């Protein structure tokens, strides 16, 4: 499986600075997450269709991170230094590895237009964000517009995002919000990003081949080199028997869960030896 440690699917996939999992995996049979991970969306906001992404990412047969729009070279007339106190690494304001915070440069935020033709022969998971400032001052300071837009279109996706500024309860010390979006770009398709402000540009995208049909397990059980056909939240099970009373929510070729304490079939004769 894919052990995420203290990270949630969101944290791992967005590239939360506390998530990395060193030289990473390229295939997994299921996902292992903790009952309550402590590292997710370090900068607050809404993750669109999150339970759907979680399900689609359960089992993956092929998986490669690629710098869809390289940070160091893609935005010459924008600032890409944008970091947050809420997204800290060690003792410093950092940001998500897979996304880029684009703000003004030399008093302007010029229009952007960046397309990507899927040359991977696999689905490409493209993730972006939309920043929603708490006040019009910040909106103007960062994007130099009050009439901002973010268009994102493919042959199977088309959404225009306008930022909505508002007084909000602080979450991780932010009044501001970043709403997370994704799409699984089909082999051979082009995706176009076009904005005049508020785009949290995709930096890294993922070429993948979606597996069979798996799920996520939330367990503090240790990981092991053992091989199974049936996995339970508390440990693996011997799948040769027709029934089990271990756990109702399993992943694999599993015996049917039953509430029973015993299910023993007599083969021999009544033992009556005295």
């Amino acid at each position, epitope marked *: 499986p894919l052990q995420l440690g203290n990270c949630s699917v969101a944290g791992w996939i967005l590239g939360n600075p506390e998530c990395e999992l060193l030289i990473s995996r390229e295939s997994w049979s299921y996902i292992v997450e903790k009952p309550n991970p402590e590292n997710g969306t370090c900068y607050p906001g809404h993750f669109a269709d999150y339970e759907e992404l979680r399900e689609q990412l359960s089992s993956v047969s092929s998986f490669e991170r690629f710098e869809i729009f*390289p940070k160091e070279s893609s935005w010459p007339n924008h600032t890409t230094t944008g970091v947050s106190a809420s997204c800290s690494h060690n003792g410093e304001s950092s940001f998500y590895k897979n996304l880029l915070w684009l703000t003004g440069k030399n008093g302007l935020y010029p229009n952007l237009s960046k397309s990507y033709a899927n040359n991977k022969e696999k689905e490409v998971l493209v993730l972006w964000g939309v920043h929603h400032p708490p006040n019009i001052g910040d909106q103007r300071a960062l994007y130099h517009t009050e009439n901002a837009y973010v268009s994102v279109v493919s042959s199977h996706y088309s959404r225009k995002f306008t930022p909505e500024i508002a007084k909000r309860p602080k979450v991780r010390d932010r009044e501001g919000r970043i709403n997370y979006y994704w799409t699984l770009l089909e082999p051979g398709d082009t995706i176009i990003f076009e904005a005049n402000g508020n785009l949290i540009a995709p930096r890294y995208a993922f070429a993948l081949s979606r597996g069979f049909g798996s799920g996520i397990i939330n367990s503090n059980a240790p990981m092991d080199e053992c091989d199974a056909k049936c996995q339970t939240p508390q440990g693996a099970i011997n799948s040769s028997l027709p029934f089990q009373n271990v756990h109702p929510v399993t992943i694999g070729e599993c015996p049917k869960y039953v509430r029973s304490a015993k299910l023993r079939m007599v083969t021999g004769l009544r033992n009556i030896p005295s």
Partner: antibody
Amino acid sequence: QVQLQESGPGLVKTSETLSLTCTVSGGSIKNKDFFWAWIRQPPGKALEWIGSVFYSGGAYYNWSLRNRVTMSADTSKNQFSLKMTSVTASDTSFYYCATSYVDNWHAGLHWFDSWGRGTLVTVSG
Amino acid sequence: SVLTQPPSVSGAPGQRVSISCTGTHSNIGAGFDVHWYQQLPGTAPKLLIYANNNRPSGVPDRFSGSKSGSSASLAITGLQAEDEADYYCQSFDSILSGDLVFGGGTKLTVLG
């Protein structure tokens, strides 16, 4: 190991539409590692990139031409094409077809190889 | 032409010529590799140098490439009459859509 050949030279009426086809030999156009190019050059002048197309029809275009050009690929005939609308005399050029080995497009490390002979397209009333 | 080339350079046979290709913050200055093409009278261009300093097969050790900062240079040592052609440098520009760009070209004249 691949050889490229542009369609025949000809005339295009002013304000009309220019069509060209390149034919790939010595290999398949259906290769994930190439983006097929159309370059042009007005006689005596410099080279200009028009666009590059993946076999699926996914393309990148020269910003200044983005709204006049369209490129496609035909994996059966092993050909890729160019369609340019509202032609001006400025569109009178040598039209070349080439190809690029591409890993990550926005890394910008790719060049052009396997160039064709070129085809003179003359724009006139 | 987003990349700037001297309209012309010349050299006597056996001398070293250097054709410069000077760019901006959005192309060479952004970290994009530089490639060169040789164009002989009335022929289609051909690749001469790829990935800043690499020579394809059939290109002699006389032809070399270098890139520093936001500028590149094609150098030809021990100039031969056969080298008399146009020379184009090519790179990439990320300012807008992410485009492939060419230099204006340089006509090399071999003397004597």
